[PDB]
Every structure is written in C-alpha cells, then in structure tokens.
Amino acid sequence: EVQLQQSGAELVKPGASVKLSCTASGFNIKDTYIYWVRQRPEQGLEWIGRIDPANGNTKYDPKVQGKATITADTSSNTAYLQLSSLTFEDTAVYYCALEHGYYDVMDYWGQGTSVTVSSASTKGPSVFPLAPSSKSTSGGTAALGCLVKDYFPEPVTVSWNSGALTSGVHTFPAVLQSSGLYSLSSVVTVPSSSLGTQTYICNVNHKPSNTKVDKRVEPK
C-alpha cells in the first residue's frame, strides 16, 4: 500500500547543515499535501510548514523562518527538509504524513527521523545478557532479557528473534547514567519448560553507530 518511509536518525555538530528525506512509496499522486512536524522529547509539537507538489507556496512558519526550508523531488517524489544553523533547540523527532482530504479519506505517518545536535561523537552500546536464574522462575514460569549500556545517540531499536517476538515484551525508556550515557533493558517472560534449547536473541540495532548485534541469551 503506502509506506512513506523516512531515513534513519542522524547526529551532527552545532553549526551544521542537514537535508532530511521522506519517501512516497504509494503516494505517487500530486494532490497530496505533506507537512513538516517537530516533537521535542519534552512533549512539545509544532507545525513547521507544508508543500504542494503543484506550487507549494508554503515553506516556512512564524518563529521558524530562516531555520528550515522544504523542497521536493521529481524522481521518487521525496520531499526534502533542509535544516541549517542547527542548535540544541532543534533536537526533536520529525515526521511526514500525506492526507488529501478532498480526494482520499485516509493518511499515513512516516517512521520518524530523530536528530541529535550535540558536541559528542557516536558510540555503539554494550549488550550484556540477563541469564534466567533458579530464582527467576515464579510458578513454573521464568523471565529473561538483556541490557544495553552506553549509547550516545538515543535511537536504539531492540528486536527479538528477528522481529518475530512481541509477547510479554517490556522495552524500558533510556535512563541516563552519571557517565552521561544511556542504558536500557529489554526483558520478556517465558515458560521454564523452554529450557530445552529454546533459543532467544536480542536483535538490537544501533543505526547511527552502524552497530548491529543480535546477542543470544542462555542460563548461566
């Protein structure tokens, strides 16, 4: 159907230039009106602007004029979001959506592209497993997981058994350490009878640092 996929997260230094991309997939039509949206982690959203494939007179928004500029593509119909003079206030999650209310009756939102404007460098996390002990069983049923420590860019995607597991999943928010780094744990509950070589893996992925490790978990 439609996908409207955007690129992965990025990290630059204060005083850089960035041009974001959000693909069209199923929206090859020219009647769609895609808008730009910011979302800071402090629960605050804003309307950056919009664009019309046919004469997109929109390109700015008061209090933002000069900080960004949208443009479009004719090869794959991918709207580009140029952002320069970046500061830490620009740090937010951004989106794209196609809703033509006078032609269609549905829309779709992009996966999201996260930006980090800080002076620190990229850093792949550390993946230490969580073996199920004899005390990790509560009523013939145990639990397990893994821990990801020390990743500077916030976007870390913990998959399990290659996007095939979802039952009882609890992925924790990124708590910061005194080291100035993030850490989280991805746990899951399982039956104690699965000790007969039922294998599970933390298919974690760190797109910024190009850090992709799928670590297995084993008791003791």
Binding site: L45, L130, K135
Partner: protein, 213 residues
C-alpha cells in the same frame, strides 16, 4: 498568532467510564479542528477531522465538539484499553497551530509484581564493571519503593530505576532498578538482595541470590 490550550496537564479515568477532554483557543473556527493520538513511543494518529470522523477510528467511542473559543472531546470507554496522549490542531489557517495536549491515566485494580533478579553477565566482568538489575514485570500502581542490601549492608545512590509506559492490554506497570559498582566492590561480597515495599503489598518482600551457587 493563533494559540490554543488543553487546560489540563494530565488526566486519569476509570476503566469503563467516559471522559471529556477540553481544548480552547483565542480565535473562532468550525468544521476545521482535527485531533491526533501519539501512541506510546509510536507515531501520532489521525484521530479526527473537523470534529467529525476519522479513517479506521472507533465506531464512536470518542466524540467531541465545540467551535469558537471553546471545544471538547468526550470518550466513552466501551471497548477502550487505549492509553496515549491527544492533541488539537488549528488546521483552519496558518500557522495550523496545535495545543498542549493531555495524558491519559487509566485507573485499574492494584496488582502485585512478579520479581526476578539477574546477575551481571560473565562478559561484563571483563570490564571491571558489575550491573545488577532487579526487575518488576507487571504491577499497579506507580508509587512504590526499592531497597538494596548486600550481606546486610544497605546501598544508597548507587542504584537507578527505569519506569516504562503503561501496557495496552493489562494496565500493569514495569520498572527496572539498576545497581552498579566496580567488580572490586562486587566480588567483595556474597549475598545480594533488593527489598521491595509496594503499596499493594503487606510486608516488604526481599528477594536475593548467592554468588557462585
């Protein structure tokens, strides 16, 4: 410059009752305001248009109106496990301004957690660090208290907790308390525990494990 508000920072309702969310502004417009839901960690969703309908929405479990300097949105929990945050937009004209939005706190019964403790990975010892995690799978409510003990010795400050969002199905909570020190401090002792005094518990339940089996 058009502004708007929710006049409510956080909201808490029961499992089945209805709840009416307000959204106000400084101008006046009709059949133009839409609403959205930012699902927990998931993208915002097209919740309404013009205060009318929305694709693949609820039958009518949520409903609201109000034009001019007043508006609302009432949601009857008929088959509603949904817990997220919701926002109003002034899509009638530029800057298509938004609003403060309000969180939704589904109330439910008290639930006791299931507790499991995990030792640091043998791999983590190769770095001189030791991260001990006490886990709480499913429980309610939010307010609680954790205490760390090592061969009777209490611990302070050396622990950090991570609080999840609320689960879609069960309204149970999940927290991860993380105790971390050097492997030197670690190997210096044998018995490690986390004491847990939950509001939905009679006496603090202290779970432990001995090193080296």
């Amino acid at each position: 410059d058009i502004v708007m508000t929710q006049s409510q920072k956080f909201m808490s309702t029961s499992v089945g009752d209805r709840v009416s969310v307000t959204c106000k502004a400084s101008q006046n417009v009709d059949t133009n305001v839409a609403w959205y839901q930012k699902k927990p960690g998931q993208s915002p969703k097209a919740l309404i248009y013009s205060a009318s309908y929305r694709y693949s929405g609820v039958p009518d479990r949520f409903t609201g109106s109000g034009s001019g300097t007043d508006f609302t949105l009432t949601i009857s929990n008929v088959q509603s496990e949904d817990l997220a945050e919701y926002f109003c937009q002034q899509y009638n004209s530029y800057p298509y301004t938004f609003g403060g939005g309000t969180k939704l706190e589904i109330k439910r019964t008290v639930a006791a957690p299931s507790v499991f403790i995990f030792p640091p990975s043998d791999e983590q010892l190769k770095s001189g660090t030791a991260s001990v995690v006490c886990l709480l799978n499913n429980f309610y409510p939010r307010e609680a208290k954790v205490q760390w003990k090592v061969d009777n010795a209490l611990q302070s400050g050396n622990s950090q907790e991570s609080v999840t969002e609320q689960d879609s199905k069960d309204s149970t909570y999940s927290l991860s308390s993380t105790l971390t020190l050097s492997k030197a401090d670690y190997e210096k002792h044998k018995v490690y525990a986390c004491e847990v005094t939950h509001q939905g518990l009679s006496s603090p339940v202290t779970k432990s494990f001995n090193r080296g089996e």
